[PDB]
Nucleic acid binder design. Sequence first.
RNA 1: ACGAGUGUCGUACC
RNA 2: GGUAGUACACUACU
RNA 3: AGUAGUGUA
Length: 2008
Amino acid sequence: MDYQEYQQFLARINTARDACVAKDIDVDLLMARKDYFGRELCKSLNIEYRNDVPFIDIILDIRPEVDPLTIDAPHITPDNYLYINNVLYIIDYKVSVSNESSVITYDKYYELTRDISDRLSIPIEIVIIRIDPVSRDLHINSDRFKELYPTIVVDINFNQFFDLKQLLYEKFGDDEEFLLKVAHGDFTLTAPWCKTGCPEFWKHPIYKEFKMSMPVPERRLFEESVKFNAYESERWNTNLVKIREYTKKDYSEHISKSAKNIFLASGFYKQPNKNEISEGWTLMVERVQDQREISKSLHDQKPSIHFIWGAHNPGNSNNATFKLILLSKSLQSIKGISTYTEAFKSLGKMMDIGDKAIEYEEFCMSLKSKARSSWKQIMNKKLEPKQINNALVLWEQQFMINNDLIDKSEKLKLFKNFCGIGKHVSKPKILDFDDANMYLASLTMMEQSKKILSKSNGLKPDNFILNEFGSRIKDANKETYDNMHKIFETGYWQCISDFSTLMKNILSVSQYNRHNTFRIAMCANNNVFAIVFPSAKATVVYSIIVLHKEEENIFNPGCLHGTFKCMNGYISISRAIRLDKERCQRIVSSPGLFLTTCLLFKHDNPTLVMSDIMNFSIYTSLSITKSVLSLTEPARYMIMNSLAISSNVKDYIAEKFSPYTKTLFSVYMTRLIKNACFDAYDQRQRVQLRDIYLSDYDITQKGIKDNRELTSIWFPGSVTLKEYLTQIYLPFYFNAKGLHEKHHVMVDLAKTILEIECEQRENIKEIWSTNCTKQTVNLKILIHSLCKNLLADTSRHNHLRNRIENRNNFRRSITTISTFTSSKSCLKIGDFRKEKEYEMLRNAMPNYTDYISTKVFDRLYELLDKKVLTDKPVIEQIMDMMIDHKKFYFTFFNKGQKTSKDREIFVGEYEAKMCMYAVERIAKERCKLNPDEMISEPGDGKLKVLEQKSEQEIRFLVETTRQKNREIDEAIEIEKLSLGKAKGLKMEINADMSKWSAQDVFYKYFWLIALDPILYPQEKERILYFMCNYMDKELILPDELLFNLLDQKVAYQNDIIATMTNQLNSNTVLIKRNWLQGNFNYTSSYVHSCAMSVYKEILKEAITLLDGSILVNSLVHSDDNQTSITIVQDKMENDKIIDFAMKEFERACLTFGCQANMKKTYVTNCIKEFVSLFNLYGEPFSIYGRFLLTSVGDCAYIGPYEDLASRISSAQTAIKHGCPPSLAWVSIAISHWMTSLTYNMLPGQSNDPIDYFPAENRKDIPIELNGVLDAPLSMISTVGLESGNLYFLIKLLSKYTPVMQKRESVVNQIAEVKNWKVEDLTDNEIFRLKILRYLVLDAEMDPSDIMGETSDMRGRSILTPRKFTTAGSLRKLYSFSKYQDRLSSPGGMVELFTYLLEKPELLVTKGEDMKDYMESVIFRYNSKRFKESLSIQNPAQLFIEQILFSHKPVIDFSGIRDKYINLGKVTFTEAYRLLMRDLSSLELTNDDIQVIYSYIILNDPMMITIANTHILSIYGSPQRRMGMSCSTMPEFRNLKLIHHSPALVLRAYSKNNPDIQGADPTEMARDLVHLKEFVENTNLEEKMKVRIAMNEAEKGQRDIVFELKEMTRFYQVCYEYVKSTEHKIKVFILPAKSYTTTDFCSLMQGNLIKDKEWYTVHYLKQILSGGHKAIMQHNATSEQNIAFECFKLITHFADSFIDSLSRSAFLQLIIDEFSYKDVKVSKLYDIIKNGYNRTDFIPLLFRTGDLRQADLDKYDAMKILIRSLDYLNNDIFSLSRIKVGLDEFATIKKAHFSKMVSFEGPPIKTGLLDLTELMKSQDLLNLNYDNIRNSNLISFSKLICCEGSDNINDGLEFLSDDPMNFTEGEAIHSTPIFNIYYSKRGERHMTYRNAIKLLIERETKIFEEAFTFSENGFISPENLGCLEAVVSLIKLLKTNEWSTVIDKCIHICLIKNGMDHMYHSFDVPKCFINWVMFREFINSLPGTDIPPWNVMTENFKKKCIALINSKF
RNA sequence: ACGAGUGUCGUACC
RNA sequence: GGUAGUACACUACU
RNA sequence: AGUAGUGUA
Ligand SMILES: [Mg+2]
Ligand SMILES: [Zn+2]
């Protein structure tokens, strides 16, 4: 941890050049890690630190009286010992990831100490403390030791040692001897998976083709390699080395040629520019005109928004019946003649209620009351229309189509030519997007929309989002709050809210619409209506009707049918719209999308116009068509390529960009993109980089400058680069998934697949070539690279085969693998004609391969039941299937993604799944070792990897450039020399691969299989036979696609499908070279990595020819490549290098069969983009807008709480990806609004709970009771929706704890709960506490409990609606048929249930046996929810059903009442009322409050830590986020009590045998003991037994299913208790790098409070608590950390800012009276003295005496006499630094000065400076000399306490005169130009005192000339009289900080001028209490306009005038 | 009419 | 020409 | 363990 020791290790690594000493380096590194952990553990435990203390020594120490030689002490050396309570504990520190060494050392030490334990009559305990370096989880075996130490708070980081190990291994990676020397064990191969290999593989036609393709020597080499057995051979790498040596000549020749190409390359690469963009645009428009039908008519446009809107009418009433009457009258009174005017008038007559409004209301109310009285739908009773006036009414807003009221001809005209009901190869018609008239029409449309919608609403901006989240959003960003207020005031919000409400009403009324009825939908607007036409994927037909007084005052986005005159104005009818419920639901959610988009685009940008942003967002948010889809996604490639250094944007536009402009908005956005391309080319040079700050240990202040110089894209303004990237990339997420149509997408996907297959069949005939032919692989280079990479990878780890089998469950059963037991679909081949009934297709097409789709688990059940599969180890069965399954069949379906063209998705059969599983797991485990591979990297860690690569490339650039240009810089401190100096080049190739799986040479994987060392020859033969049979796979065409292709009746021109299928005579097509998408990810990625390694070699050699330095980092996921190249050379310009690098990148991709997408491949100098993730310049960046937009996404629609928890997930992910707090809060508000809208809980609505509960606002109601979340954003991110209860409890603590403990730790504050008075609690608090006590917890719980259930062990759902829903067909499931047979079997259920009781662990864990699996599969069918999931369900239909059933009795209140002490289903409102009634009778007591606190907070260490962070937080100096970084969330529960896996522990507990398969005998015993203790102390077994007994007695018969359910919850709780370290991968973008839990919490809290700036957070006490997950914590930690921080801060502050002489007196004075963090510093000093950590404060102790020479001896042991020390420190006056020897220096570690604000004490008055305020000073404590000398007199005036000082020179004497540090910045001279700033030791003239002197002189001169009221000067007697007047004035009035700072500044000026005597003699002038003339004088004050004091003097005068006027 | 489409579709049926 | 089972939301500062 | 959702390729 020590930085000097880190430097020492770095020097050892750098200077080392022998692999024999690198082992010494690594061993020393491991010892340093162990000793560091031991020292930190001893500090935490507060025990004296020892290492390898002799056992005889410890025996003598514990028993000095006994004579030595009484017994031979064992030679073992314990790390440390501890003797308390007559028990000796032998402690051993271990820093390992495993327990093998721990257990063997435990056994050895125990055996060797038994004899001494018996003799000396002392029990000896062997305690092994083990820490896991990668996840800091502590493991302790001795429970007695853990009893001694209840809280162990070891919080340390091992990242430094990992970095050194990585540096050593990368330096000596090329040395195979070093790898062998550091290898663990030898090369070991497990037992062969198969006993025999395929003999028919050699006869396979595919193998014959491959063999004939290869030349003869390669055929021989392939046969030898596949027939090679590593275990039999003397060396495993015998054949690998032979092949590598054979191919070395060709490999070296290829590398040398490719390197020689650098000279032949010119400087001209594919630069994007305006000419290329224009030519590409011309080619694109030509291609689009050829492929489409271009229309120049505006009347051919399609609706941009399927809606028309008009402002409301304040004069008219908003009652529903009045609106209906008004609509009927307006429809009837249409004047004029038109096509449908008579139909509209007839409809208005049909809906004419007349004057019988009361009768209509009564009829509708009676119907609704009848409907709502039943949980189920009312059946068998027919609704009969009632005639009211001329209206035949069936329901509210439902009317008959009366044949008498409408002519038949008019009715058919309307229904067919208008609504399309009863209605009934050319090119798709699209508008001309390049036509000037068409673009002018689009501009006119957008201008009209802006004009109509920019006006004010005229109504209150009050709404749910604002009311419930305005405070949070305002505190986060007042500007965001103001933007929201403006948005809600404008008319865009009213229009989109009206459209959403109206569309929800349309969806509600369309469910029960009949064929002869039409519905009327109404919204809050009294002028906007909807008429829903009859309808039967369900569709909705609606027409929007708008009433407006003035014509042309309507908002028409190309949806209007016509505007007609009526009574009292005009009526406008929109054209009929037919939409899918999926698009309708998006429209309903659209307000959230609109608000999110507007706030994202406007955030932190004053140069943008909110009107323009909303004008764009209203169209993108409501876009539900493919027209905008065709533009959003290609825009990324177009604009990003244009900004790039090298890109083929011209070819991209010409060949791929295909705008689909069916709408005027699409035309407008096409023009926007076109302009943005040229602008992006023009403005690529305005990107600038921040000044890098390098500390040589970490990088801070890195990235890209924030200057708004780039032009905005979609709307006028200026943006930063980050905002520009957001504007480029966010629009892709405006698209909607599932917009495609199955018919067309199946046709296109089949066409693409068959076209690729046909092209491969015809054109592609060569497999191996040397000239980089398309779809061809260079054989020699491939083989050589594969050999090299395989050698390196398998040399890295010696047990690769064992690791594969262990991690992939190869040795375990088939039923224990998730991918083989899932509910995903799989293909089944065979005769299934009966189930499928299709008949016509079967008869008409002979060669039809019959197939059916089934679930994976069902297929596994079938194969197990038919004995095709067994429960033997899975790998043996997999290889058996590799031989048996000769024919592979696949089918495909469309993904339905959000891109313009859908993606084909392939489904395979079970045997193919298993074979590919084996191959892919082998490839995966070899990819894990390779650093370049990125699929093996867990998700979201790729951001951290990108950051690390960028940081090391920055460091390499700086170091290499400085090292090379040292000579030139020395010569400078010449222009000709500067010309010839070396320059740095940085290159980022963000690349894409074209047709990764479609066009790939599958033969290159044969070599990967054959050259693999870890496989046996028989395994290789079987796998190669599988691959050969895979290359003969057949694609089964889908039945629906075949149906449509057979129902055409007109022959297609060139039907590729018919050609490939023999004129539709077969449904199967043979696919050979296209390994199917997604099946061979790891293998393809490995070969991609090998290709990039060859590229790296080529680049390194080529740069070697240039005598330069290069660093190449390549990241490869599957087909997405991120290659960054850093070059520092001087021979040639950068253009030649860029051209050469790009040409060789393309050539290297083509060499290995890959093909880079040059259209989508672009080169940048700074920006990295690997997988939707960006690294701007060392600084991580991500588009969190996608997570922000997914806040309104679909959910399970289970209930109000379940729905909310799903969307808070998206909010939290957005927070993790860098979303600012205000936008995160907006997303949370939108999620709450969406849920409340779904369940009709919005304010004022029926299910709104605010009235029924004692709460002022919905923040007071619990989430489970339908409140809104109220908690800090850091809490929401960390604990995740438990934050509601946590925040409520913390607020209760902060409100009711006594003042003495108010600033104590959470455990102490909870211990003080017994003193609470329950009578003082408010009604809301009482209600919430009762809810927590009785609804969340159990009545049996007692405050005396020591262990209890954690919040993760219990659910939170209370009010969940129930639905009467049919299960579905489920006919095709063989397992379901077996389950039905078993159910119909006599009593089979009792046996199956009995088996599940006998093996209860099967309920929660996977079974390890076929019988166990088959029983579980049969059992799951009992649960209704599983069957519902099995049936396909539409989320759109579920959402509408939840809306409709909101008033029906759905809540089962019996279950809720069963929760507390001791009917029919109930509605939401009645449930609220009943819950309040039930809770009224219950009582609450201090005992109950203690139970709540103990069971909610004291259980979880994470909950305790979060509560401590909230209570004890101190917020420091604000600062702008300069350089961000990634940091993963650490583990909050470090202590581990269970070692074994939870499944194994549960299996052992179900039985009583600690000895289980795969379970360590003795290790499982303690886990079983712990689990039994947990069960007994929580009384789970007793509670379950009592519950089942009571239920059995109540029912009268044994409810066996109830017993199963009880066992399920019991084992669920047991599983949650015994769950081990999950170690989730959760990374965060944070202002700084965090290493420990406290650092992470500080960074989270400081980052998630304000949008503008982030704060430094330190904690008053120690936040972390040492405890276990389910054990109560009643012990708080010590204050030693506070003492350490205090005295480190004190020593270093005194050294830095105090003169050498005054330092000791300063220390003594501050020790005597001051206090740190509410703790007296004398007490902290006593803690340090009377403690076992005194070697960290040797200089501090020396200055205060102490030492006693024991500390010096201990320090020497860590590596010196007292008098020698005293003599040596004669010249040194440093409090923090002392010299024990002539060169040895004992020092105290530094602490950040931001914590100095925690010191409180009496003033330290010396000279005129009061040092207390200096410690409290914020500006003047900075270490940099420049920053100190450049501070202001406003800050400096705080330190002035003169009381009669004459000279500032003697006043400032009490300041440090040692040299300070200053930041010197230098340029780098690289193609991306940037400056690095590094602090360096300054010379003598720059000291703290000198900086203060310069500050004083400059600022006082400025202030003097600012306040020379008289012309003579500052010292003139008249000016002095004016100063006397002003000081008397300010003394006479109330003190203000303006007055104080002005007084201090004038005082310091007078001290400089030596006017102090009169200053202290200032009094009221004799000419002056005439307040009138004081006012006259101050109003006559000649205030100057000097800029710093201009605002200051005016404010001071104004405040004085206001105060003196308020006085009178 | 609307959704989709350089694949004949959905658009309630006999 | 005839046929076309199918119980309910919003109801508002507008 | 099952189910749902989201992001990624
Ligand atoms: Mg990419
Ligand atoms: Zn003074």
